[PDB]
């Protein structure tokens, strides 16, 4: 079934979309630990704008709290709360 | 408030996820990016990576614009990841 233009266009326009982000991007200095899962689902701006002089960037951000397991190789593991950046709103803005 | 471990674990695991992929002087395509299923997320250990195991094509209408001269709807075929697995890296 061919996806009709109207649906392709609405679905791909600049907005916050679920993105699977590795935890080391947000917690880079944690080489002594293994996190599980090692990545988390976050809303991040994605998609395209109508003009090539515009770019899809966040205009409202906040953090989201998730339960993560943090493993110390050979020395057990704990469940804890970690906090990650998410994009609440996104807009097409001039590249400048 | 807080996403629970079971849910973070299940939702983050290697699977096909909707990804907005750019299609690529005379023409502009609109939209310039399309929504496609692409393998993503993570696996149980750092020795494993999430890869596509079943793929297929999907046809979408895309507008081709010659600015201030014309604009046509055309069909384009894109690649989809239907299934993904965690497999040893190398």
């Amino acid at each position: 079934e061919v996806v009709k233009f109207m649906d392709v266009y609405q679905r791909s326009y600049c907005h916050p979309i679920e993105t699977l982000v590795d935890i080391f991007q947000e917690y880079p200095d944690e080489i002594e630990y293994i996190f599980k899962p090692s990545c988390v689902p976050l809303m991040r701006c994605g998609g395209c704008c109508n003009d090539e002089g515009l770019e899809c960037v966040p205009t409202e951000e906040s953090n989201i709290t998730m339960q993560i397991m943090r493993i110390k190789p050979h020395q057990g593991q704990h469940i804890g709360e970690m906090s990650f950046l998410q994009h609440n709103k996104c807009e097409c803005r001039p590249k400048k | 408030e807080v996403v629970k471990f079971m849910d973070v674990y299940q939702r983050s695991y290697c699977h096909p996820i909707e990804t907005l992929v750019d299609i690529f002087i005379e023409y502009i395509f609109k939209p310039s990016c399309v929504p496609l299923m692409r393998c993503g997320g993570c696996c149980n250990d750092e020795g494993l990576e999430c890869v596509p195991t079943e793929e297929s094509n999907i046809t979408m209408q895309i507008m081709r614009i010659k600015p201030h001269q014309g604009q046509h709807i055309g069909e384009m075929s894109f690649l989809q990841h239907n299934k993904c697995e965690c497999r040893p890296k190398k």
Partner: peptide
Amino acid sequence: RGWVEICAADDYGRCLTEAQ
């Protein structure tokens, strides 16, 4: 950023129970 402990856990991410 930041860590807020919830519990020591097993390999499945379920909290351990106290022995006593």
